[PDB]
Amino acid sequence: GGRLVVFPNGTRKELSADGQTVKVMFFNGDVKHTMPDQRVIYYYAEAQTTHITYPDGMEVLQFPNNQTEKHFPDGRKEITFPDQTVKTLHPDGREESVLTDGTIIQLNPDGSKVIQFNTGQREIHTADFKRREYPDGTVKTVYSDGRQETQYPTG
């Protein structure tokens, strides 16, 4: 029916009957579960933080302010902030944020960006210009040289 082991330092270990699941309760309040599929779930008592390691290389952190950070095996990092904005950082330096209101911000490592507003407008920033595109077909652009351009809708 399983076993409980208590060590002289106060750390306790519980083993399932099939020995597949192990739970370790450390003397400092930390708790570690090792699951049959080899997922390791570690709870830091003082920091109130959970760190989960998956056998495929993925790692997930859950912070007590309800922030979650996911690290994919490729290097990708995905943050869900308390507000539920999702920000993805790619190893190349690209960053993408998907806001709850619907806004999307794409930032390139060269510093260029594309912003998609929940209002249906789109903004593009490059080394040569900042451009705003409107749902009615209007395009407005300011160039690095200071000139401003409005392209009117065909209709």
Partner: peptide, 12 residues
């Protein structure tokens, strides 16, 4: 025996 992982945050 068994010892926990080091705390991520510095002690107060």
């Amino acid at each position: 025996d068994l010892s926990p992982r080091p705390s991520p945050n510095p002690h107060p």
